[PDB]
Amino acid sequence: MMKPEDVIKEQCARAKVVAELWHGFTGGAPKAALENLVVEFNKAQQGRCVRPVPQGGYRDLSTKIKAAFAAGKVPTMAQAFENNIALYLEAKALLPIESLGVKLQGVNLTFLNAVRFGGVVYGVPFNKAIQVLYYNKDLLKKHGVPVPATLEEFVAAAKKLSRAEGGPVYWFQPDASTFAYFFFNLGGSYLKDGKLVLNSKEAVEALTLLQNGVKEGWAKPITSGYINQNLGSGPYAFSVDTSAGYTYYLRAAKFDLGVATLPGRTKGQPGYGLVQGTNLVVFRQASKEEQAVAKDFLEFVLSPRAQAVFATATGYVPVTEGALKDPVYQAYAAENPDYATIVRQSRYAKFEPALAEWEQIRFDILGQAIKEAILNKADPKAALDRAQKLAEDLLSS
Numbered sequence: 001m002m003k004p005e006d007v008i009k010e011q012c013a014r015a016k017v018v019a020e021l022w023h024g025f026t027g028g029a030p031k032a033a034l035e036n037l038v039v040e041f042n043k044a045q046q047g048r049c050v051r052p053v054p055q056g057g058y059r060d061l062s063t064k065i066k067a068a069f070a071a072g073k074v075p076t077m078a079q080a081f082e083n084n085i086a087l088y089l090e091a092k093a094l095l096p097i098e099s100l101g102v103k104l105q106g107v108n109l110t111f112l113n114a115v116r117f118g119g120v121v122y123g124v125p126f127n128k129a130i131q132v133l134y135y136n137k138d139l140l141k142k143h144g145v146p147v148p149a150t151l152e153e154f155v156a157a158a159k160k161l162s163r164a165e166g167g168p169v170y171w172f173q174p175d176a177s178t179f180a181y182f183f184f185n186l187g188g189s190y191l192k193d194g195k196l197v198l199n200s201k202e203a204v205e206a207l208t209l210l211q212n213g214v215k216e217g218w219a220k221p222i223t224s225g226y227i228n229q230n231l232g233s234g235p236y237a238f239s240v241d242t243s244a245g246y247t248y249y250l251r252a253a254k255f256d257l258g259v260a261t262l263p264g265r266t267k268g269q270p271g272y273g274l275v276q277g278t279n280l281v282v283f284r285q286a287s288k289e290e291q292a293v294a295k296d297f298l299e300f301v302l303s304p305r306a307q308a309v310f311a312t313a314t315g316y317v318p319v320t321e322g323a324l325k326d327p328v329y330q331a332y333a334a335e336n337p338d339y340a341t342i343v344r345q346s347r348y349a350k351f352e353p354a355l356a357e358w359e360q361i362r363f364d365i366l367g368q369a370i371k372e373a374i375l376n377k378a379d380p381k382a383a384l385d386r387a388q389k390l391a392e393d394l395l396s397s
């Protein structure tokens with residue numbers, strides 16, 4: 001049956017110039033909203049079009065971009081994390097954005113700062129997400145437990161509900177993204193006078209908090225799929241998870257889903273969330289005509305309506321001031337207090353390091369330590385000491 005990618009295919013077959021955009025959206029609301037955005041853009045051009053090409057997941061995309069370098073042909077544009085941008089700048093692969101003529105006035109300074117390398121912007125914030133606290137409104141009401149506003153209330157609530165339901169009710173992936181929440185909110189930072197450190201006392205404390213949660217019966221490790229693909233077996237109260245998960249949790253949940261700001265050290269402020277999602281980069285190899293399509297496409301992506309529509313469709317955070325003044329954004333915020341909660345959460349935001357090696361480290365070295373500690377009951381300090389050695393050895397090579 002006809003789909004957006006068929007409309008795009010036809011638009012691009014008729015186009016005189018096609019700028020390929022390589023992305024990591026495997027489906028769901030993110031892929032649909034990317035494709036909707038592109039259809040709209042392509043309609044307004046006269047045979048100057050973007051062609052989205054799915055490369056799989058984010059890791060699959062960065063592997064395929066690496067392979068594209070080695071075959072000597074890259075797309076016009078791709079999604080990239082900040083650390084992927086640092087790696088692409090080692091090959092001088094990327095065009096400065098402002099040079100293209102993309103205006104970045106009114107882009108979230110948090111987002112603009114993350115894509116600025118030696119003071120030059122190399123990425124356009126596109127699909128930016130923040131961690132939020134997903135919760136089961138039914139299950140908290142069932143036991144008279146308030147939505148926890150502090151890490152202390154969160155622990156207390158997880159223990160109270162786990163005892164009542166006979167099962168661990170805080171669900172989490174044993175991964176670098178989850179670790180980041182507890183780490184940042186315990187005072188952790190990864191760079192110590194510019195050196196990457198995985199085994200600082202806050203890192204040990206954060207990984208020890210999670211392991212103790214599993215041993216005390218209040219934290220449930222999710223070993224297989226996303227948290228929202230595990231719902232329905234046993235009691236669920238809480239997860240800390242990307243706002244881009246919103247639509248997946250909504251579809252999956254057989255209970256009344258809640259979205260809250262993250263528990264923090266005090267009721268003064270929500271906790272910091274990890275910023276995830278990606279920026280758009282433009283490859284130097286692209287033709288003049290392909291770069292001009294990239295320019296107009298990046299200008300369209302940053303428009304208030306494109307941002308309003310994309311962010312309300314997905315639970316991504318609008319990247320511009322102007323998006324919050326767009327009536328489409330405003331109507332959705334009015335009907336759904338979760339949009340507003342997600343934006344409010346976007347104000348308390350921390351990033352991972354932008355090192356070229358950070359992808360490999362976060363998955364294969366830090367992610368593996370966290371797994372060893374959570375699933376194989378490794379001593380948290382021992383597991384992070386090893387991670388630090390392996391990280392040091394990788395950087396040295």
Ligand SMILES: Nc1nc2c(ncn2[C@@H]2O[C@H](COP(=O)(O)O[C@H]3[C@@H](O)[C@H](n4ccc(=O)[nH]c4=O)O[C@@H]3CO)[C@H]3CC(O)(O)C[C@H]32)c(=O)[nH]1
Nearest residue numbers: 025030058059081083129177226242244245248276277359
């Ligand atoms: N390659 C690479 N990946 C990185 C890096 N830093 C973090 N991440 C990954 O960004 C994902 C967050 O990005 P986000 O755009 O916020 O959310 C994603 C999906 O996570 C989420 N999703 C999809 C299906 C589903 O059933 N549930 C669901 O939540 O929807 C979005 C589009 O797929 C995390 C998840 C991870 O992939 O396990 C590892 C994390 C890096 O440096 N490099």
Ligand SMILES: [Cl-]
Nearest residue numbers: 026027028029
């Ligand atoms: Cl899908």
Ligand SMILES: [Cl-]
Nearest residue numbers: 231232253254
């Ligand atoms: Cl469910």
